[PDB]
Design a protein around this nucleic acid. Structure first.
Lengths: 49, 99, 49, 44, 49, 316
DNA sequence: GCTTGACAAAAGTGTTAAATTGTGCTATACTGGGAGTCACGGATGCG
């Protein structure tokens, strides 16, 4: 399974967090199997009436 | 103390201008990559090899596929047949006919 | 440390084969991430091994 | 000859290229006869 | 997921972050930050910078 | 402030604390609710295989039964998942026995989960026994097999670690009989094996230490700085051999023409492949015994001190 | 500059026995750990 280099997950600044625009704790929850995150969504069922 | 390395050192005459003739073979891999191996003068032509990328490969020339085979793995179904006969399973399938 | 990876990876390779529940595979992947993190730089997360 | 030293961020393909083999097994050396195993961390 | 799990994609762990960085575009946030630094006055300017 | 909050800030980075709370999201099943699940699993599996058995020939079936069979398969899969999830607490209870014996606690829990899986693929309601009673044995099997297979840097196989454990338990237990740590005599008197094999076992049970330990009453030196290499190349020898190659092959060889030519092939000095008599008799037009005769002549002439005086000093 | 032949020791073939290594299996019931804090600069927000 994929894995993320620890040097970039955290370190003040967290390069990954700034890159993706997620807070360190929110990013921590995603990487470490504690919360789900939406990768993408299709407009064909968001702007469809 | 003295330490060991499970090895040894030798110093005999190295050279390149005189060499034994290589026999070069190439192997295609199930992941799409190809690799090369130089063999000795014995003229051996192995049909299968294990490559650097951790995946097995077979000679590009393509001789004698599937050189050898091993017992298939056991499965939950076999592990069930070892403790039940087909009649009971058919009876259960009948028992699950409707809701 | 390398072994702690090669073990946890290998078992994961088995768990995917068996089609184990979501909890089992999620825990295995979390342990794999933690082991790789320990391998690269120990002590920046949690207690050191 | 040395002119400058570059330090990039290695990708997966570079890591694959740097290796001539894959460690598919966790043993280091055989407990008996003291030789490396066929797929261990010390494989010849 | 049960009621419209077909409309989107959600994931957890380092795999979902792999996807997030995959779909992330460098050319997108750069302009947003360049505008926010000068457009903003207070803390937002520092965050964008 | 930080003083109070720090004790819980790290709580999110402790899988031992978090897994044992995420685990208990399903109530433990009882006897009445597991026979149904087992039967449903069996029905689903049998239907799934019957699809293939029939497809070996190929036929069409009613839509109602066609959908009911797939429903049975899916819901039996759900039953299996539920049964697996319902006993992870027992898995943890069993696994927490082996904490501290090499393997990591969470790894032990995972191996107990594997044992639980293999147990559920054999638990048989028809015998009327409980799932816990049967599955405990398989959980122990898996956990102990793993703990004996990969709890050491050097893999002592299952059959060998077995006898190692026998020896350890006997050595620990027999002390109370006499008040001493048993020696090879006492150990052999009860292990049904001779002392030399016992010594070999004790040597085999050895484990490697780490080089990174710091020695010297300071954190400056290390255990490993003073490791003398027995394989390191010595320059003088590297020189000496070359001189020999420039003294033996170059000078002394060039004194008997074809009579010295046999030495080139006989000892393989020019290629590295030593040759037998006949093998180098047939390159010329002479028999193997003729090669032996000329070799004897060369040995007698070269062995004489008048020439050996120069060559002797290397290992005189 | 060297052969015929005859003997005994060393280098190979093959079958068999013994040991060594790997996987599976055990059915009363038991169901979720436990280990000896402060100081520093940076992100957030107040006017």
């Amino acid at each position: 399974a994929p894995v993320t280099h620890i040097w970039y997950f955290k370190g003040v600044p967290s390069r990954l967090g700034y890159l993706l625009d997620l807070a360190p704790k929110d990013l921590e929850k995603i990487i470490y199997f504690a919360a789900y995150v939406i990768t993408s969504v299709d407009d064909e069922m968001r702007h469809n009436e | 103390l003295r330490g060991s390395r499970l090895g040894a050192v030798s110093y005999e005459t190295d050279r390149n201008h005189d060499l034994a003739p290589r026999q070069v073979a190439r192997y295609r891999t199930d992941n799409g990559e190809e690799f090369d191996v130089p063999f000795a003068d014995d003229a051996e032509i192995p049909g299968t090899w294990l490559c650097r990328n951790g995946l097995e490969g077979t000679l590009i020339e393509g001789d004698v596929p599937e050189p050898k085979k091993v017992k298939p793995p056991r499965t939950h179904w076999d592990m069930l047949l070892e403790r039940r006969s087909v009649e009971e399973l058919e009876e259960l399938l009948k028992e699950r006919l409707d809701l | 440390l390398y072994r702690r990876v090669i073990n946890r990876n290998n078992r994961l390779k088995r768990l995917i084969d068996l089609g184990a529940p979501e909890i089992i595979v999620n825990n295995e992947k979390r342990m794999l991430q933690e082991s790789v993190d320990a391998l690269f730089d120990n002590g920046r997360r949690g207690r050191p091994v | 000859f040395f002119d400058e030293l570059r330090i990039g961020l290695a990708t997966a393909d570079d890591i694959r290229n740097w290796s001539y083999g894959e460690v598919k097994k966790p043993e280091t050396i055989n407990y008996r006869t003291l030789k490396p195993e066929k797929d261990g961390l010390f494989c010849e | 997921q049960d009621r419209y799990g077909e409309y989107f994609t959600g994931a957890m762990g380092a795999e979902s972050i792999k996807k997030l960085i995959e779909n992330f575009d460098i050319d997108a946030e750069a302009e947003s930050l360049r505008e926010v630094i000068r457009s903003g006055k207070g803390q937002k300017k520092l965050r964008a910078l | 402030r930080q003083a109070r909050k720090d004790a819980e800030l790290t709580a999110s980075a402790d899988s031992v604390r978090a897994y044992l709370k995420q685990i208990g999201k399903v109530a433990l099943l009882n006897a009445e609710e597991e026979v149904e699940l087992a039967k449903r699993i069996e029905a689903g599996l049998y239907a799934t295989q019957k699809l293939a058995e029939l497809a070996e020939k190929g036929e069409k079936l009613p839509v109602q039964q066609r959908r009911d069979m797939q429903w049975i398969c899916r819901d039996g899969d759900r039953a299996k998942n539920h049964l697996l999830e319902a006993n992870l607490r027992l898995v943890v209870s069993l696994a927490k026995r082996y904490t501290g014996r090499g393997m990591a606690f969470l790894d032990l829990i995972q191996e107990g989960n594997l044992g639980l899986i293999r147990a559920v693929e054999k638990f048989d309601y028809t015998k009327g026994y409980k799932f816990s009673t049967y599955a405990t044995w398989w959980i122990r099997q898996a956990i102990t097999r793993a703990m004996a297979d990969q709890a050491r840097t050097i893999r002592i196989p299952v059959h060998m670690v077995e006898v190692i454990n026998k020896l350890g338990r006997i050595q620990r237990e027999l002390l109370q009989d006499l008040g001493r740590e048993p020696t090879p005599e006492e150990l052999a008197k009860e292990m049904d094996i001779t002392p030399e094999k016992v010594l070999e076992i004790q040597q085999y049970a050895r484990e490697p230490i780490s080089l990174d330990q710091t020695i010297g009453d300071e954190g400056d030196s290390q255990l490993g700085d003073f490791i003398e290499d027995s394989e390191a190349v010595v320059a003088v020898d590297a020189v000496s051999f070359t001189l020999l190659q420039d003294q033996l092959q170059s000078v002394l060889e060039t004194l008997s023409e074809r009579e010295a030519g046999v030495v080139r092939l006989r000892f393989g000095l020019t290629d590295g492949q030593p040759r037998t008599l006949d093998e180098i008799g047939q390159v010329y037009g002479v028999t193997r015994e003729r090669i032996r005769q000329i070799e004897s002549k060369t040995m007698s002439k070269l062995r004489h001190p008048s020439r050996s005086q120069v060559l002797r000093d290397y290992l005189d």
